[PDB]
Design a protein around this ligand. Structure first.
Ligand code: C2E
Ligand code: C2E
Ligand code: C2E
Ligand code: C2E
Ligand code: MG
Ligand code: MG
Lengths: 406, 405
């Protein structure tokens, strides 16, 4: 009976705390290791890694290939980066949790730097959020910090990882807390709007892109702080419908003479009620329909082409038009332009970031010709310096947008 | 050390085999009890209960109400059934697994009858039960359990779907069914029947299309595999094939009357299918007037936004649509006013299984609503003149079934 109990104990232990796919700790293992680390010392850092490319693999090539990639990333992650008291677990379907005790901020960065380099050799599309615990924090607090840091990494892909320290003065909220605050901001009309003009070299204004923000108790919140929570909760269409209503009100006032570019989140386009909503509202404001440009992220066209085409049809049937926002980020998978024929393409802002890389300049010219050959206006994005402005000039970009154009 | 070892083992067992929401065994616990029961005896029955209304609750009222309903049904299940060695587990998000050892068929049926009446007290579900009469593996029983559940859904007049383990019917897993359908599509193994829906004076309103296929002498009807196609998000592939084959028949200028094509619910919630129907109809505008798309009532009440996009695309191209299983959700029947379907095909539960009086009033009311809105009412699956005369007493316009054609 000894052999029964001893081996039954290990199988029960692995059933309770081990995820069969990744062969790492499961979510319950992670919370146990997290709660014990906090109650004893709480000195160290915590990190979360999301493998969105594994999510894209699951429906594309089935789950046999998806499970194999989870195991591969798990095997590659765990055999590398071995330190004392290191907890590595699979806390959800597409994200991994990591606990690094007895490490200060600089030590976590080298571990986080080693994580990312550990995922470049193994598939060649991920996001890494890391937080350092420098105050006494509860377990829900660190998970909220971990989630907001992950949103920071996604919203700024030029960062290798998103870093937030537990002592930060920044407002950190959970997903449902962000949604409640946005609903509060929508209800009380706390929103403010900015209009950035996209101008040609001749001063002709193509359109003015609308940026949404809101303020509560003297604190200002921008869209990249809460948009991850709304899309994860399938509530971003509430936010987009409010912005579209407010923008159309301004056009109905006969004030703005030029077209306005409204950003649309991906989670809103995959909502069929939002696709019906656009047709119903655009038909009630046909006079201003020609002055509305809907800015659709490139991720929509390549990941949700059918939802996007339904949205694009509704937009154009009502006398409006649309463009692409992160144009060029998904290079070698950018043939959707030929099918969709957008009115414009707004370049990925990472093109103004790495001018010196010769391979970056080759991709930039190639996607520039493709749009113009089809008669599609190209727009450079987030241009800050005359150096960026002059370097983008060699790629025959028609109109420019950013702080240097004012 | 003895009491300590028992606590460590019990807590380890609790983390491994307890579902925190339902406070029942989880899936791993159920597979363990099933694999042990099979390897020990294998005598008895096995059952699956799917609470589709709980899936409606999670999006409707959040997860706090969804967790509470799972616990309520879980407490209801364990306290009501009072027999030995009964495993009650939550094997998936919205379905419960039950093992009933040492029971013959009549005992399984009274236990299955006790389950459903146990869920009528507190609150839309399906119960599938199989009796083990063979030496069967675990995957076999799960496949039988899934096909029995599909039998219960495709025949809602049954309280539960019953399959014997020794049945001659072809029992396949979800991916196996999907493989067989794709094989039939590739080789054009499909056959079609056209059943006419006629008015009281013989005018044919349309002809509904029924799809089936044969593989080396075995015939398969749609209700055997459609459940596996709607799961795995693959039913639109089958519907597109049927639509393609029907349009080829209409192009030949033979059929003077419209054809009613059934569309699965999982196909309309696929946006690629909504795009496909517009492109296909735009290439065959001449025959679009001869196309009626029969949409299940569950689409209009559970997936109204997808259905509105599909209905608009269908009518924009010169086709039309109607409602299938009309009256099954009598308590949510204002979609008719918004959608204005060309016809409503009554739930076949109104022709058969309809002498309890409360159901006879619902038939009259939903018939008035359709006629007042100028919508054609069609009785379904009419077999006898007795039914035919009785449906006329509810002023039904046109009739369909074996007795008319
Ligand atoms: N029965 C049931 N209870 C639920 C469910 N969702 C949340 N609860 C609870 O709601 C609290 C707030 O969750 P959140 O708004 O999504 O805000 C979350 C979320 O922003 C983040 N977070 C937690 N887990 C994860 C994760 O696995 N991945 C990512 N990226 N963020 C997470 O930390 C914050 C708080 O985490 P929690 O401590 O777990 O605190 C959560 C959780 O205890 C559910 O689906 N079913
Ligand atoms: N270093 C530098 N930065 C510049 C420059 N020009 C603009 N930025 C800012 O970069 C973002 C450009 O908008 P986005 O890339 O489409 O990315 C947007 C956009 O995806 C989203 N967003 C903003 N407003 C909305 C909205 O109203 N609706 C939706 N669905 N998303 C919005 O949040 C993101 C951030 O918007 P903002 O915080 O206001 O930040 C804006 C803009 O203020 C520049 O020249 N140099
Ligand atoms: N690693 C991995 N493997 C997967 C996954 N999905 C399916 N499989 C594998 O493929 C086999 C076929 O499952 P199925 O085709 O959907 O066909 C299923 C299905 O028709 C039926 N059925 C099975 N489980 C359930 C269930 O939990 N609920 C309901 N309603 N029906 C079930 O039993 C058949 C499968 O028996 P299984 O022993 O479970 O054997 C499964 C399982 O080993 C997955 O997501 N990840
Ligand atoms: N006792 C009796 N039975 C009758 C009578 N008339 C028809 N039945 C049959 O009942 C079903 C009526 O079709 P349904 O209610 O829409 O229910 C259909 C329908 O929902 C689906 N189905 C059949 N063909 C197709 C198809 O081509 N595409 C899709 N998406 N579903 C189909 O499978 C289900 C079963 O169709 P079938 O097995 O061929 O069985 C058909 C029909 O042959 C009658 O007078 N008396
Ligand atoms: Mg933009
Ligand atoms: Mg039908």
């Amino acid at each position: 009976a000894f052999k029964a109990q001893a081996k039954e104990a290990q199988q029960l232990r692995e059933r309770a705390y081990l995820d069969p796919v990744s062969h790492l700790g499961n979510r319950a293992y992670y919370m146990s290791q997290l709660s014990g680390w906090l109650s004893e010392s709480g000195i160290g850092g915590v990190a979360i890694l999301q493998a969105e490319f594994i999510k894209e693999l699951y429906e594309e090539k089935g789950y046999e290939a998806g499970d194999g990639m989870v195991r591969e990333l798990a095997d590659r992650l765990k055999n590398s980066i071995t330190i004392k008291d290191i907890s590595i677990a699979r806390i959800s379907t597409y994200e991994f949790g990591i606990i690094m005790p007895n490490m200060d901020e600089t030590e976590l960065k080298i571990v986080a730097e080693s994580i990312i380099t550990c995922v470049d050799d193994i598939n060649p599309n991920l996001s890494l959020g890391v937080v350092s615990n420098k105050r006494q924090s509860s377990t829900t607090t660190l998970l909220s910090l971990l989630d907001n840091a992950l949103a920071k990494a996604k919203s700024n892909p030029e960062l290798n990882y998103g870093f937030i320290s537990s002592d930060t003065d920044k407002i950190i909220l959970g997903k449902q807390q962000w949604k409640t605050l946005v609903e509060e901001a929508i209800h009380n009309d706390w929103f403010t709007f900015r209009y950035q003009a996209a101008n040609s070299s001749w001063g002709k204004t193509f359109h003015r892109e609308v940026f949404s923000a809101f303020e509560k108790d003297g604190v200002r919140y921008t869209a990249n702080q809460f948009l991850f929570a709304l899309e994860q909760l399938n509530a971003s269409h509430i936010f987009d419908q409010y912005v579209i209503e407010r923008v159309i009100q301004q056009l109905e006032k006969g004030e703005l003479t030029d077209p306005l570019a409204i950003n649309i989140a991906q989670g809103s386009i995959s909502q069929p009620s939002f696709i019906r909503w656009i047709s119903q509202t655009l038909s009630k404001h046909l006079s201003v329909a020609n002055l509305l440009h809907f800015e659709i992220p490139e991720g929509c066209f390549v990941n949700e082409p059918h939802y996007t085409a339904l949205f694009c049809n509704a937009v154009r049937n009502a006398g409006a038009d649309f463009g692409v926002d992160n144009y060029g980020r998904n290079f070698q998978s950018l043939d959707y332009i030929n099918e969709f024929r957008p009115k414009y393409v707004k370049l990925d802002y990472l093109f103004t970031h790495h001018l010196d890389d010769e391979r970056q300049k080759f991709t930039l010219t190639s996607i520039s010709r493709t749009a113009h050959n089809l008669g599609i206006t190209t727009i450079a994005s987030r241009v800050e310096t005359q150096t960026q402005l002059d370097f983008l000039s060699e790629h025959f970009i028609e109109v420019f947008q950013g702080f240097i154009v004012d």
